[PDB]
Structures are given as C-alpha cells and as structure tokens.
Design a protein around this ligand. Structure first.
Ligand SMILES: Nc1nc2c(ncn2[C@@H]2O[C@H](COP(=O)(O)OP(=O)(O)OP(=O)(O)O)[C@@H](O)[C@H]2O)c(=O)[nH]1
Ligand SMILES: Nc1ncnc2c1ncn2[C@@H]1O[C@H](COP(=O)(O)OP(=O)(O)CP(=O)(O)O)[C@@H](O)[C@H]1O
Ligand SMILES: Nc1nc2c(ncn2[C@@H]2O[C@H](COP(=O)(O)OP(=O)(O)O)[C@@H](O)[C@H]2O)c(=O)[nH]1
Ligand SMILES: [Ca+2]
Ligand SMILES: [Ca+2]
Ligand SMILES: [Ca+2]
Ligand SMILES: [Mg+2]
Ligand SMILES: [Mg+2]
Ligand SMILES: [Mg+2]
Lengths: 436, 423, 345, 54
C-alpha cells in the first residue's frame, strides 16, 4: 500500500476538496466522527482505502489532506462543518489577506510568507507514509491563491519530493460564475510555471459543469454547491482505482503511463454519464452511457474531439457492468463515431469496472443510477480551451490592461510574454499531433 | 474581519457622511444608541467592516469626523445618529478654510492634520486586517478638498499597502457656493489621480437634475441631494457590508474595476428613482440602472465606452432573470463596451433590499465618458486662470502660479488619457 | 434585434446576404472582432471554430461546417470516396482517380500506373487529366510520362478524362453543370431549383484546352466565341431542359437531375457523422457548389465540390434570399425555391 | 476485437480492448526569483516614499 496526499489550494480547491472527502466517507462507510465500522484492523492496516485515510489508535480515519488558503473564511467552514472531526487542526492552513485575484500577489508577495509553513505541514503527513506515491492538487486557474500559490507550491514539491508524481485538478475559468476580469492572466501565468512540474492535470471548465447542471439537473441558476457535487463525482471516479481493489490506474504513475505519452500534453479530457435529476427514470444501459461519452454536452470541457486525434483512452465504469457489454457497445460506437487515433498509438481502450454503483450525497441533486462511466481521453481537441484562453489574454495584454497590478507586486512584465510564448508553443504542439 | 476606516471631512463630507451612517445603520439594525435590534444574521455577518464592537454589545462606527469649523459637526452630534459616533473621533478646528484649497492643504489644515492622523492610527491599530480607508468629501470647498487630499497623501505615506477609496462631490455652477470651486476641484483632482485607488465621482449638477427633472422637486435643497448620495453610497458598499463573492473587498473591487492606475474614477448609478408603491420588474431595474438619467456624474455614457462595470442587485428576485437581463444589455449595446477587456461586466445580487424598496440596483461604471466631467472643470478653471482672477486668495497662502499651471496640465493629461482608450 | 459579423469581405454570396439582413431592420452588423454576435459569416481559411458557442445567452450560428474541407479538396475528396464504405472504391458516379504526391516530398503512383497499362494494352481510351487545389494549371495528355513529370514541376490528382462528353448542338461543344446545395443547422439538404451550365464556346476536338475546360474565366479570355450561343456561356435549366426534349426526347429531371440529387445525398450523408452540429454548442450551415459532368450516355459524373462557391448573376437575388429564409431566419426568426433531399439522420 | 489483460477481483474487473495496431529549478534558484521580486517591491515603495517626502 502506497499513500497519496491531497492538497487543496484556494476557495475552489478547498470547497471542491470538502465535497470529495464527503463523498469518500460515504463510499467507504466512514462516519463524520472518523469511525469506520467495516474496518476491523483498528489503528492500522494497509488496505486500499488507507492510501487516502490514516488511522489513529482510537479508530479515527483521518484523511491524508492539507487545506491551504490565504483567507480564513472558507477553511473555517471545514473547521465547523459536518466532517470537522475528520481533520486535525494542523491540516488546515489559513492566512489573513488573500491574493485579491492577483497571481503575483499569491505567488510572490503573500505566498512567500506562508510557503515554508505549508511545506512543513505537508512534511508531517509525508512522515506517516511508508511509501508515498505523490500528491493530488486541487485549485482554480482564475483565483489569486489557486493560481499564484499553487505554482509556487508545485515548484517546491518538485524540489523536496523530486521522485513523487503530481496530479492536478484544475478549474478553468468561466464568466458565468467568474469573479475577476484578470482570470485569463492568472490561468496562463500559473500554467506556464506549473507545466513542467505536473505529470497529469484534469481540467474542469465551469462553463461545462454549469450547463450540465442546468440541462440535466434542471437547476435554473446552479451554485458552487451544485457544481462541486457533480465535480466530486468525476473526481471520485478518477481516484476510485487508488482507493478500491483493482488492476487499472492502481498508482499515480499509471495515470501518466496510460494517459500521457508526451509529457507536455498531459491534460486528458473527462466525460461523464449519466447525470440524472433526483427530482425526476429509465435506467440507461451500458451501450447508452458509453455512447454518451462521445457527446460534447457531457464533457468537462466543451470541445469537439471529432476534429482532433486521440493518444489514449480509459473507460472507468461503476455499477452493474460486465466486460461483454462494454465490448459490444464499443464495436457499435466505432461504426458510427469519428474516433481518430494518432498513427504512433494503438486504437484501443483501457477499461476498468468497479461493481459498486456510484454513491450520491443524500438530499443531493444527482439521482442514484445502476451504472455510470467516466471516460479519460487524451484528445488534441482540448487545445480549444487553450485557444480561447490565449485569445482573451492577447486582447487585454495588447493594451497592457491590469498589468500594473502584477508589476506592483514585484513581477516583471516580461513574465507575461514569457508565459504567453509558452502557451503559443503548447498550442503548436497540439496542432502538430492532431492536425495533418 | 477586514475593517474599513471611514473619514468625512468638511461641511459636505460630514453632512453626506452622517446620512450614510444613518442609512447603513438602519440596514444593519443598529439604533442611534449603538444597540442591535435586527431580525436577520446577515445584518451582523460582516458588521465588523464598518462597526467596532464595544462593551455591552454596542456597535460604534469606525468613522472619523474632520472639519476646520465646529458648526457642521455640532449639527451632526445633535443629529439623529449623533450619539452613535465615538466622541474622541470628532477632530475639528475653529478657524475654518474659507472655501480655499490652500488653507485646507497648506496653512489651516496642516495645523490640524497630525491630530487627525493620531485618531486614524488609533483606529487602525485595533484592526485584525485593515482593508483601507474611504473618504467622503467635496472638491469645491476648502476643508474636504484641501485638507482631505492632504490627509490622503499622509495616510498613503503611513499605510502605503492599503486601499484608498473616496466619494468625491464634484462642483457645478448650477449648484455652487463660490466662484473659486473650479480652482479647488482642479487642485484636488490631481491629488486623487495619484493617491486614490477608487473614486466615485458624484456631480452636484447631476444630483440637482435628478431631483428637478426626475423626482419633480422644483426647489431642491442640499438635504434632497444628500438623499440620493446616501442611497447611492449604500448601494455601492453593499458588496462590502454583506456576504458575497464579487467585489467583496476594496482590493478585489479595484482589481476588477481599474485596468490602468490613473483611470479609477467611477460613475455611480441608482435605481429606482421615483418621485412609489409600484413593483419594479428585473427588466425595468436593468434598463433604469444603465439609463443616463440615473447616473450621478452628469456624463453621457453613449459619448464614451465602458472599461469595466460593477452591478449590484438588492432584494428577493430571480437570479436567473438577472443574468438574462444583464446579458441582454451587453449584447444589445456591445458597441459601448470595449472589446479588449473581455467579460468586463460583473453582476452581484444581495438578498437584503434597501429601506422602503422591495428591490433596487446600483451601477458602478468606469467609462471614458467621465472625461466630460474633467473637461467641464478644466474649461471653468481656464476661463478664470487666463486672467489670474481670484488667485490672490491662494497666493496669500504661499502658493505660486506655477502650481496652478501644473494642476491645469495634469487634468488635461487625464482627459487625453481617457481619449486614447475611447478610440 | 439580432447581431452578426462579417469576416470574409471577398464573399459575393454573403455580401448580398449581409445586405439583405440589414434591409430587414432587425439585424445589426458588428465589428469583425466583436464576440457578442449571433451569426458569423466567417473567413475561408482558419476559421476559429474553437471560440464559437462560448458566449452565455447567445445562440451562435456560422456559415461553414467544420471538417467539410474533406469534401471540398481534390486530394481529400478522392481519399474520402475510396476509404468510405458508404461510397467504396466501386463508386459508379465518380471518375477513377488517384492521388499523386510530387517526387520532391499515402501516395498512389504505382497503383495509377497499373491501371494505366491495362487501358493501353486493352486498346481502350487512355486519356487522363491532372489538376490540384492550387490552380487558377491543368494538363490533359494520353501519356502517363507527361502527367507525372508535370506534377513534380503541391499535391495533384489524376483522374480519367471523359473522352465521350455530351455535346450541345449546334456547336458540338462541351459543358458542365453547377448545382448549389444548402445544408442548414438541422442537416436538411436543400438543392437550389436553378442550376447553370458553364458551356464551352468552341467545338470539342478529341485530337488546345479552350474547348476542354469549361471555366468561365478561360472562355472569356482564351475563347473567341464567348457569348455567341448564350449570354456569358451560361445556359440555365429552362433552356437546357427544352433542348433535351427537342434533341434527345427526354427531360432534365429524368435524364440528369435524378442522378445529381442521388450524388448530393451520398456525399453529404457520408460525412454527416463527422461534421453534424446536432449536439454541439454552436450551429453550422454552409452553401456548397457541386460540379457535374454528363457523358453522351446521359450519365452524370461528379468532378468536385466547392466550399465557397459563387452564384450566377441572375440568380444572386433569389438564392441569397433563400439562404436567409431557411438557414438564418430558421434559427433567428424575424418579426419554396429549394428541393428538400429527404434522408435518414 | 482483442481483449487482453483481464484481471478479476471481488470488487470488479479490468481489461484492455485493442481495435487496431498502431501505424527542474533548484531551491537556490527559486529563492533568487522570490527575493528578486521582493526587492523590486521595496525599490518601487522607496521611490513612492521619496516622492511623498518631496
Ligand atoms: N467549480 C467551482 N469553482 C469555483 C469555486 N470557487 C471558486 N471557483 C472559481 O474559481 C475562480 C476564482 O478563484 P478562487 O478559488 O475563488 O480564488 P482563490 O484561490 O481563493 O484566491 P484569492 O484571489 O486569494 O481569493 C472563479 O473563476 C470561480 O468560478 C467552487 O467552489 N467550485
Ligand atoms: N475528369 C474530367 N473529365 C472531364 N472534364 C474534366 C475533368 N476534370 C476537369 N474537367 C474539366 O475542367 C474544368 C475545370 O476543372 P475543375 O473543376 O478542377 O476546375 P476549377 O476548380 O478551377 C472549377 P471551380 O473552382 O469554379 O469549381 C471542368 O469544368 C471540366 O470542364
Ligand atoms: N451634495 C452636497 N454638496 C454640498 C453640500 N454642502 C456643500 N456642498 C458642495 O460642496 C462645495 C463646497 O464645499 P464645502 O464642503 O462646503 O467646503 P468645506 O467645508 O471647506 O469642505 C460646493 O460645490 C457645494 O455645492 C451637501 O450637503 N451636499
Ligand atoms: Ca484498518
Ligand atoms: Ca517532476
Ligand atoms: Ca492658527
Ligand atoms: Mg480566496
Ligand atoms: Mg460650505
Ligand atoms: Mg474549384
């Protein structure tokens, strides 16, 4: 058994992390006070769920997580929340004044004064791990802390844990729920400095999650709570192999091996199905949910894979699914869908099935389903998200709009063009792989 | 608790500031004695932003009252909410400023500024996390204009890493006290350009027109004008005084609203403005919110372009419909929003409406059309300065004609800076 | 009050469409860089499809189908027909074609020569034609050596030249048929009722490319009989149908138009899965120009498909109005000249 | 077409289906950048105080 440490940075990271660990406890039968009745090995054990939970002598299962935010308001919710008993206070790190949606403020000015404290707390959880695989980092692109401080943390982690893998869960900015105009700046800045330090990053576009909540859950004006519930389901499907017995994606290294042949192109596209309103149902079959994995309306990032190429593809099923039905659905899909792989990669799918059906928070918006699937595909079409982000960056930076806020924090104007040039190179790489 | 320190200076600043504290005290359920008698926890959730808590569960406004004359502050102390202010926070002289910027900034104000800074230091020392300062004042007088900008300069020196915000009343010949107001306003504006992060430009010409043309007040008074300012000030600070996600603090507001450091002068708007029990639909609020007749700067928005816009909706209403209407306004009038700042319009909704209204909307716009306001002041300034008229009032306080020439050039530069971004 | 932007100033078809939209008083044109638009008349090359459908509260429509270039490129069309089971290499309405890459750069040089030798040995007609997508440069020869050497001198394509074309009388001249097809956001296939025949003004000689190429520009530049028979070497369906009845005792519908409609459906239905915007965050429509060849046996052959075609002068007003009616107003209603080719989605 | 590496356990099973064969900076450097940014802030603030002193 090898442990994983979860790091949640900023409001988006903390709130999403709070929803994920709530889902983890429900899936593993862990009560809010930390007691796990099904865990017969009291105070220890090397079970699959122990990769995410440590055990005390009193039987409490403590998540291997660190919560960091430059403002105390959001983390104070966890301190007095339903699962406040899970985390000891050392895991919750809060500042006083946040990054004010300013990458430079979160990276240089305020991050410099708290970076050592965060690492020391991380070191405490690392000392409890017999073998540490790496870290899972949750953050937003647009926030000052989520962008600026995450990039600083990623650099230090590569220094102190050079042999450990690092995976990202990143929230792509969407104007419908955005809180700052400079989010395109922070997104590109944090991507530039984190690109070499991340082995695999799962981007979630708030626009896609927002529309899925409206379209499929009949939510008129989705809130962060609605968005995070859906996001935690996708995250749970992705990390389920690390927490349950299985043979696919059993460790963080396998994610890079199965999804990332080219290190820079490490942004797999996530597609989830089915999303069913609890207020509403005809249960969908294996073929129907598998076919929905190729509908853009169900993707975490709105893009068209038909006009890109695939480098890898994993199917993660939860519920009543047998391999025979998966293969039959795949055969039909190939005869109706435009699925183009790169010539230097096999045209196939890695399939993982967990018999336990997806867990839903009681009283939530997602209805219980007999079977669900999350598809992780490394498609060049996801570069459309970079193109949108880069265009907005170009519009503002041409006039130097808002640049003085970053320069005032000690950042140099050249870093803007340095980061933009890196994004331009990244866009070029995607076009070479996916376009003839 | 991200505290804000409030300062009101001069006759106009204290009269408007007093009404403002009266308005927000009612919203937060604070009586004139400082006791809380509300019925919702949203009122007290961010009460610490503007109020200190004392013994006996009392709430004392974090406000400092400044004037070179005692008359107006004596009225405030004897006013409705006079007893709620901290007695030691009344800092006043006796000489006065004579509607003279030099007296407030150089001679009379200089003698009193240090004692004001002592009160500011005392208030700041007891802050867990100080956001910055907000100042209410007029630019046409001597104390608010002259001593107010001197206070800003010295506050910035002692607190360089804090946000400086002002509600600044712009003089107008329509509602005027002395002919030297263009002189005082021009001198103050340069100070604001350098030493403030956010300035809400409130034009007495616009306030009078709204009272006369819209509210149907044939003989508006200063009290009537201050009614609009109180309501506008309450609306613009709504995101600061109640839980929310957008523009919840001074620095985040500045980051969203100020693409260039010197272009930080905002046009405020309020809706509805009724001369009264009729319910107002969300589409009606949005149209009136963006209507020039509801603006407080007496500038035509169609004469320029919006760099950034902050919208605040208050009351119980369909947030889905609010998003639709806001998107409709931008899409139907996209030509008036600069395309090089994508998604430059941010909308916030607060459940608690203002007193007497089921719902309301507050508009904060950073428009290049504000240059019309500075052009008007510059023309009035030059009309007198070219003949050196009334300069002796200022040269008698030690000022030189060169300082007036520099102020004239600085404001013309500010007008030119707005012009380049409007094309 | 809908909004639209113009990003292709050289489009004669959509210049009229833009003019008609403004004439309705309900469409407002924006700057070409303004993102808050309902309709985009995008540019031909590198249209930013990835930035469409991401504007909240805006239904966005564009006048091109992403991925349609597979059907509107010389090399792409040949590859699509051979590799698509819906069309197969045994396609009967498409001339035998081969994609040949220049030697200075898969390729089908050896495959092309294998079929060429069979015709030479079999005494059959062995005349081929070479062309590319970078031309105004077309070579017609009966010797394979000249064709290959010419290409080496961009990617070209070689296909069998129809040595027995249908020749109009009087004149003994060659011609080609242009059909305009509109595909809306629902992927309905609308065929404009009015077609044109770009005829050659010189007698056909099977033993000079003036009488072999039906290009309007070539006929108006290298032909000395331009406009002799019909105005601008353009014969419309009304006249051509009358000629078929008088000369061959048949109608345009039965002899030719049925095959044309069949070919249009086969091509568009083949690529429907790859380009449909049925479940996409933005919607697409596009106007296509199909060029057909008719042999002496009244058999219709497909030459190429144009993604950005121009319309006949007399037909500009009617066709552009139809575009606004069924393609733009269908998605943005305001305050038939087409034939619907029904199919299975 | 081909199913390979079929692994079965109590909680589920996994496999692979193939349809077609194929055809860092050091801590010293990090601190230098952080300290360089902090120094630029001090220089900018010092100039402001110099301007206010005048
Ligand atoms: N999906 C989701 N997105 C969120 C959530 N909270 C914030 N965001 C997004 O994150 C972006 C803003 O970043 P934040 O995380 O709020 O900022 P921060 O990391 O706390 O950094 P600061 O500037 O110091 O506040 C916006 O685009 C929001 O849409 C959340 O709970 N769920
Ligand atoms: N295989 C073939 N058999 C007979 N004639 C052919 C032919 N290929 C081309 N042609 C002749 O050459 C002409 C021009 O060919 P092509 O369609 O490639 O030119 P182009 O691309 O310049 C026309 P447009 O762009 O206007 O559709 C045709 O109109 C036809 O007369
Ligand atoms: N809106 C408003 N404006 C005022 C009020 N009192 C004065 N003014 C304006 O302020 C300017 C005079 O400044 P004033 O505050 O009286 O001078 P000070 O006391 O020395 O700061 C003139 O342009 C007046 O129009 C008031 O109560 N409300
Ligand atoms: Ca155990
Ligand atoms: Ca590494
Ligand atoms: Ca004195
Ligand atoms: Mg935050
Ligand atoms: Mg006065
Ligand atoms: Mg052509």
């Amino acid at each position: 058994m090898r442990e994983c440490i979860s790091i949640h940075v900023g409001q988006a990271g903390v709130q999403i992390g709070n929803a994920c660990w709530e889902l983890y406890c429900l899936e593993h039968g862990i009560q809010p006070d930390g007691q796990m009745p099904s865990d017969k090995t009291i105070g220890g054990g090397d079970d699959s769920f122990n990769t995410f939970f440590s055990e005390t002598g009193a039987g409490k299962h403590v998540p291997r997580a660190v919560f960091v935010d430059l403002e105390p308001t959001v983390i104070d919710e966890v301190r007095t929340g339903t699962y406040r008993q899970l985390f000891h206070p050392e895991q919750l790190i809060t500042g006083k004044e946040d990054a004010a949606n300013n990458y430079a403020r979160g990276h240089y000015t305020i991050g410099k004064e708290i970076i050592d404290l965060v690492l020391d707390r991380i070191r405490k959880l690392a000392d409890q791990c017999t073998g540490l695989q790496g870290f899972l980092v949750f953050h937003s692109f647009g926030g000052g802390t989520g962008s600026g401080f995450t990039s600083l943390l990623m650099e230090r982690l590569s220094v102190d844990y050079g042999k450990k893998s690092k995976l990202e869960f990143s929230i792509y900015p969407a104007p419908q729920v955005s809180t700052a105009v400079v989010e395109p700046y922070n997104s590109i800045l944090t991507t530039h400095t984190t690109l070499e330090h991340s082995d695999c990053a799962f981007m979630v576009d708030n626009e896609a999650i927002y529309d899925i909540c409206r379209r499929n859950l009949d939510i008129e004006r989705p809130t962060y709570t609605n968005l995070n519930r859906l996001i935690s389901q996708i995250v749970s499907s992705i990390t389920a192999s690390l927490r349950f017995d299985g043979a696919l994606n059993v460790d963080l290294t396998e994610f890079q091996t199965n999804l990332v042949p080219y290190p820079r192109i490490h942004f797999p596209l996530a597609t989830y199905a089915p999303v069913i309103s609890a207020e509403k149902h005809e249960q969908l079959s294996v073929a129907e949910i598998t076919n929905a994995c190729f509908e853009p309306a169900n993707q975490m990032v709105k893009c068209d894979p038909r006009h890109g190429k695939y480098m890898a593809c994993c199917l993660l099923y939860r519920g009543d699914v047998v391999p025979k039905d998966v293969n039959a659905a795949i055969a039909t899909i190939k005869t109706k869908r435009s699925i183009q792989f790169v010539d230097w990669c096999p045209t196939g799918f890695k399939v993982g099935i967990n018999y336990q059906p997806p867990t839903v928070v009681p009283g939530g918006d997602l209805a219980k389903v007999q079977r669900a699937v999350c598809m992780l595909s490394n498609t060049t079409a996801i570069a459309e998200a970079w193109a949108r982000l880069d265009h907005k960056f170009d519009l503002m930076y041409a006039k130097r709009a808002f640049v003085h806020w970053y320069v005032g924090e000690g950042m140099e104007e050249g870093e803007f063009s340095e980061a933009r040039e890196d994004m331009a190179a990244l866009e070029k790489d995607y076009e070479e792989v996916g376009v003839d | 608790m991200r505290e804000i320190v409030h300062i009101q200076a001069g006759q106009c600043g204290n009269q408007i500031g007093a009404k403002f504290w009266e308005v927000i005290s009612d919203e937060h359920g604070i009586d004139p004695t400082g006791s809380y008698h509300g019925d919702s926890d949203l009122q007290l959730e961010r009460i610490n932003v503007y109020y200190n808590e004392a013994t006996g569960n009392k709430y004392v406004p974090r406000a400092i009252l400044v004037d070179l004359e005692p008359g107006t502050m004596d009225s405030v102390r004897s006013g409705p909410f006079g007893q709620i202010f901290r007695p030691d926070n009344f800092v006043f002289g006796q000489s006065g400023a004579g509607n003279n910027w030099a007296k407030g900034h150089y001679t009379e104000g200089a003698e009193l500024v240090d004692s004001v800074l002592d009160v500011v230091r005392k208030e700041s020392e007891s802050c867990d996390c100080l956001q910055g300062f907000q100042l209410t004042h007029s630019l046409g007088g001597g104390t608010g204009s002259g001593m107010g900008t001197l206070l800003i300069s010295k506050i910035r020196e002692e607190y360089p890493d804090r946000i400086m915000n002002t509600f600044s009343v712009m003089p107008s010949p329509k509602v005027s006290d002395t002919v030297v107001e263009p002189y005082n306003a021009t001198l103050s504006v340069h100070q604001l350009v350098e030493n403030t992060d956010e300035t809400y430009c409130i034009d007495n010409e616009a306030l009078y027109d709204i009272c006369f043309r819209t509210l149907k007040l044939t003989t508006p008074t200063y009290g009537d004008l201050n009614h609009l300012v109180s309501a506008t000030m309450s609306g613009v600070t709504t995101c600061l005084r109640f839980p929310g996600q957008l523009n919840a603090d001074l620095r985040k507001l500045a980051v969203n609203m100020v693409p260039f450091p010197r272009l930080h002068f905002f046009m405020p708007g309020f809706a509805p403005l009724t001369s009264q029990y009729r319910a107002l639909t969300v589409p009606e609020l949005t149209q009136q919110m963006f209507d020039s007749k509801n603006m407080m700067a007496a500038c035509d928005p169609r004469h320029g372009r919006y760099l950034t816009v902050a919208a605040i909706f208050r009351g119980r209403m369909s947030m889905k419909e609010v998003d639709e209407q806001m998107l409709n306004v931008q899409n139907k009038n996209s030509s008036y929003f600069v395309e090089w700042i994508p998604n430059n319009v941010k909308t916030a909704v607060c459940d608690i409406p203002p007193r007497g209204l089921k719902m309301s909307a507050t508009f904060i716009g950073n428009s290049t059309a504000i240059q019309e306001l500075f052009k008007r002041i510059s023309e009035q300034f030059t009309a007198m300065f070219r003949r050196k008229a009334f300069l002796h009032w200022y040269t008698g306080e030690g000022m030189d004609e060169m300082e007036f020439t520099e102020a004239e050039s600085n404001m013309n530069d500010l007008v030119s800076e707005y012009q380049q971004y409007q094309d | 009050m809908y909004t639209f932007v113009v990003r292709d100033e050289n489009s004669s078809v959509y210049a009229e469409v833009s003019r008609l939209l403004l004439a309705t008083g309900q469409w407002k044109r924006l700057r070409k860089d303004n993102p808050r638009f309902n309709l985009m008349l995008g540019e031909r090359n590198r249209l930013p499809f990835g930035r469409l459908g991401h504007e909240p509260g805006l239904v966005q429509l564009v006048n091109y189908y992403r991925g349609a270039d597979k059907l509107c490129r010389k090399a792409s069309l040949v590859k699509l027909i051979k590799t698509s089971p819906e069309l197969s290499e045994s396609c009967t309405w498409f001339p035998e074609s081969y994609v040949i890459y220049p030697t200075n750069l898969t390729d089908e040089r050896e495959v092309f020569l294998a079929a060429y030798n069979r015709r030479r040995e079999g005494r059959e007609g062995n005349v081929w034609i070479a062309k590319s997508s970078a031309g105004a440069g077309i070579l017609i020869s009966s010797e394979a050596s000249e064709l290959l050497d010419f290409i080496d001198e961009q990617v070209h394509v070689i296909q069998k030249y129809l040595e027995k074309p249908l020749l109009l009388e009087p004149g003994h001249r060659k011609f080609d048929i242009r059909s305009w097809v509109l595909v809306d956001h629902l992927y309905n296939i609308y065929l404009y009722r009015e077609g044109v025949l770009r005829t050659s003004s010189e007698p056909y000689n099977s033993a000079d490319k003036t009488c072999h190429l039906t290009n309007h520009c070539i006929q108006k530049e290298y032909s000395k009989n331009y406009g002799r028979y019909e105005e601008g070497n353009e014969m419309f369906f009304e006249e051509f149908n009358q000629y078929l009845m008088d000369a061959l005792n048949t109608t345009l519908e039965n002899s030719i138009l049925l095959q044309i409609k069949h070919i249009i459906r086969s091509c568009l239905m083949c690529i429907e899965p790859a380009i449909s915007t049925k479940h996409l965050h933005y919607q697409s429509f596009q106007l296509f120009g199909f060029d057909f060849m008719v042999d002496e046996e009244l058999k219709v052959w497909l030459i190429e498909v144009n993604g950005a075609p121009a319309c006949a002068q007399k037909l500009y007003a009617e066709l552009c109005q139809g575009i606004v009616d069924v393609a733009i107003s269908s998605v943005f209603p305001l305050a038939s000249i087409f034939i619907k080719l029904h199919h299975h989605h | 077409m081909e199913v390979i590496e079929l692994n079965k356990c109590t909680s589920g099973q996994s496999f692979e289906v193939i349809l077609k064969p194929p055809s860092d900076p050091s801590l010293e450097e990090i601190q230098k950048k952080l300290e360089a940014a902090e120094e630029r802030r001090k220089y900018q603030e010092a100039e402001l105080l110099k301007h206010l002193a005048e």
